[PDB]
Amino acid sequence: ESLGNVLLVGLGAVAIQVALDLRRHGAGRLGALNHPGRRSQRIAEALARGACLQLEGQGQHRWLSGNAALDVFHQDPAELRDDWQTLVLCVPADSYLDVVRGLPWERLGGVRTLLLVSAFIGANLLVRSALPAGCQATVLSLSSYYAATKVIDETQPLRALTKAVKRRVYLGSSRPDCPARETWRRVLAGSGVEVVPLATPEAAEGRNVTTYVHSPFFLGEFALARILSEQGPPGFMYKLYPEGPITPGAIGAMRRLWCELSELLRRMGAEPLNLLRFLNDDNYPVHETMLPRASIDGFAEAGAERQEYLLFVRYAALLVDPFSPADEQGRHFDFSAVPFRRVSRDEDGLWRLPRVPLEDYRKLALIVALAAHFDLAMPQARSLLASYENAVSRFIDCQGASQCHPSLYPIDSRPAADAIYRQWCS
Amino acid sequence: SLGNVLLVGLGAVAIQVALDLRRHGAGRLGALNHPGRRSQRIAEALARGACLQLEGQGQHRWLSGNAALDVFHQDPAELRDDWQTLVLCVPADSYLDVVRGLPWERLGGVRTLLLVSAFIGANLLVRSALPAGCQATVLSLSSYYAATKVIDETQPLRALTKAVKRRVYLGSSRPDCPARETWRRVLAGSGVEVVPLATPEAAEGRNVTTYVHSPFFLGEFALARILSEQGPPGFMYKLYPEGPITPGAIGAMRRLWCELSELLRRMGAEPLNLLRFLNDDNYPVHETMLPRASIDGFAEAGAERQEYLLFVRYAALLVDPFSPADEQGRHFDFSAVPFRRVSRDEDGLWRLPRVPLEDYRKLALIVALAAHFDLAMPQARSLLASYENAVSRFIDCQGASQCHPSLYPIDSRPAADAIYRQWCS
Ligand SMILES: NC(=O)c1ccc[n+]([C@@H]2O[C@H](COP(=O)([O-])OP(=O)(O)OC[C@H]3O[C@@H](n4cnc5c(N)ncnc54)[C@H](OP(=O)(O)O)[C@@H]3O)[C@@H](O)[C@H]2O)c1
Ligand SMILES: NC(=O)c1ccc[n+]([C@@H]2O[C@H](COP(=O)([O-])OP(=O)(O)OC[C@H]3O[C@@H](n4cnc5c(N)ncnc54)[C@H](OP(=O)(O)O)[C@@H]3O)[C@@H](O)[C@H]2O)c1
């Protein structure tokens, strides 16, 4: 009714979870669009043999396992007609501009809402800048994807596993006092996530967890050395050095970037967040023994030294899951044993980067270019961008430009940042 | 210059020391071990031809050797005045008892007494028990310099050394002392560096256990594991909830280090930089985790930074950062040292492990001593109270008749008073 017929744009891990939540609520017709490729070919094959979307919850999340039917799947936008009231962008956030430009808007006049499932600062404005003149669609920004979900087996592209669910995410809208926010609150509540509506898109985008966490940890020297490796151990994303990238220097980068992003938010009329309380209360907690409530609530007024200490403790306390059951010797589950994905050759033989860190870099590069329009230099952010750029440049030097996909090459974020700022000022 | 050497307490430490003494060059080698089952096994083994046998493990294979024991005694009254050097290889809590038990009025030939694991005040305590004319020099070693155990008690004189420390410290009751240089060389044969210091208390203040075992293993988490009989033992060097290390425990560590450092200053000893001591004398971490400038600057950093650095140090050593990585990139889990827990002895009585019994006894003495220097040591006293309350509840539950008397309350004030009187003399 407020959702009508819903078109999922991108049909990967996020889309399958979102589809299960939409089918619980009642989506009218549910369709999906995914650009041509091996995945789309596999999806069409599975749907044609009668398959449905399948979502399995892992461990304590087993309760939300379910199946969802898809009414239509398109890998060719030419077949789309004006049948859709809601678009849900489940593609990577670094592709939002391309994907919105490529939609056949001449056949989508009935679209009333467009939801960005993993927004970042400026994404709402960027998407609006790409919409056709007079477009009626309200654009909604969800702060972060609300779970951890993976397609287990790429040969069963319609089956996903959700292994964590966040406690709270945030939702803003390009329409003031938007009623679609409540609809989406209900949709995500079905999986146990609390959606907090905020007054502007940028306030919600300022609560994108990966911008704060992936930037300092996965744009630094250790992560890049693992990711750009073909031999040797991949290491682990959330372990301490030398098993993973977390060091006191990375934590200092995290604090300083949070300060920079907070000032940008204030210049865009959004209230910044308390980083420690956000991580602990909205994403995943630790015991009071490790992070006392008074320290969590007081974090924004603590000194820089105390802030870095608390952030380090937070990540050290989650090397194992402190709430998991202990085994016979007293060990808890190794929560930080997610390995780094590394560079790999595509079907044209060209090196490609994994989404961590390519998407992380592209998001932060756009944010820095936007912040320039607000006379903010963002030196810590620029240091992280430079670390990535230098590491990827050395990789190209060693492997040969001939062997590298052009996504590894230098980009220019200034045009998109200019479009965002113009939309802002309009 | 060593002359004839009597090893008091013929256990693991003594067997390592005996072989180091023989490598250097000494006279007759004797031992005194108090009556008990171990002494009975030693006496039978010696009767059947046994000798002291040291095995070095792995890279320390070259420490392996045999040494004959020339004399074995159980009764201190049976000692002849034939000994120039005594080495105390018993638990440090027994040093006073051992010294009080020796017939010093007919041991005028003793020139040197070495305390292998000297706590703060041990040198003074030992000297307070000596007769007025006694001219023995007392040496304090900061800690035992290896890791050594008797493999099997059925072969009671055969010990295994698995590791040797980088560095220990040695002080003497005699200013600018020469037995001091001899023992520097003796112990150096094991590969340890002995650093001579100008007073005994300077060496006594450089034992890692005083600074680390007190905050970590006298707290609530450690005591709950140690006093448990069922459930997992947990791990001594892991973070909560797998082990006792918390920001609160690290704050206790910093505060206790400050208290101990001021006591050392009032006793005329230069205190230590805790983080530099841990990194350089116990086990290092990479510059990425603890920059050298942060290590060297630790003593002048603010309290908040000091706690952060200490927390990082222990988090960084949850795995061994210098071990070889496996195929995924994991390093060896050397923090998974299980807690030893209460055990019933031969008579059926509950006993505490040496960690934390020995650590509590040492800190109880230190606090009583510090009172004479007008130092209240509130952090130390909080750790003492934590132990006392937990052990008292254990006795309540199990029954005093089921508990070894070493669990019952102690009073360290008499020893502290003897130390302070000796220091003032
Ligand atoms: N999954 C999580 O737990 C999680 C957590 C945090 C954040 N997120 C964010 O959510 C977003 C989607 O994640 P996901 O795991 O669902 O990714 P996914 O499983 O890889 O699915 C992405 C979908 O979009 C298509 N796609 C990828 N790049 C595209 C492009 N440039 N243009 C058009 N379509 C494209 C993909 O098809 P092809 O493969 O054929 O290209 C695929 O169907 C990412 O930004 C992610 O960082 C996800
Ligand atoms: N071995 C190491 O690697 C190591 C490392 C660090 C610190 N230390 C400390 O150094 C001290 C000695 O260690 P250790 O491993 O050699 O202990 P150990 O193997 O138990 O040997 C102690 C020896 O001294 C005897 N003994 C105890 N009290 C005595 C007394 N009042 N008079 C005469 N003999 C006595 C013991 O006989 P009974 O068994 O019959 O009592 C035993 O033979 C201990 O407190 C230890 O905590 C040792």
Curated annotation (Swiss-Prot), chain B:
Enzyme category, top tier: oxidoreductase
Regulation: induction: Is part of the operon cntOLMI that is negatively regulated by zinc level through the Zur repressor, which leads to transcriptional activation of this operon under zinc depletion. Highly induced in response to airway mucus secretions (AMS) treatment.
Binding site for NADP(+): L10, G11, A12, V13, N33, H34, T148, E358
Superkingdom of this protein's organism: Bacteria
InterPro entries (UniProt xref): NAD(P)-bd_dom_sf, Opine_metallophore_DH
Primary localisation category: membrane
Functional note: Catalyzes the NAD(P)H-dependent reductive condensation of alpha-ketoglutarate to the intermediate formed by the adjacently encoded enzyme PA4836, namely (2S)-2-amino-4-{[(1S)-1-carboxy-2-(1H-imidazol-4-yl)ethyl]amino}butanoate, leading to the production of pseudopaline. This is the last step in the biosynthesis of the metallophore pseudopaline, which is involved in the acquisition of nickel and zinc, and thus enables bacterial growth inside the host, where metal access is limited. Therefore, this enzyme probably contributes to Pseudomonas virulence.
Name of the protein: Pseudopaline synthase
Organism: Pseudomonas aeruginosa (strain ATCC 15692 / DSM 22644 / CIP 104116 / JCM 14847 / LMG 12228 / 1C / PRS 101 / PAO1)
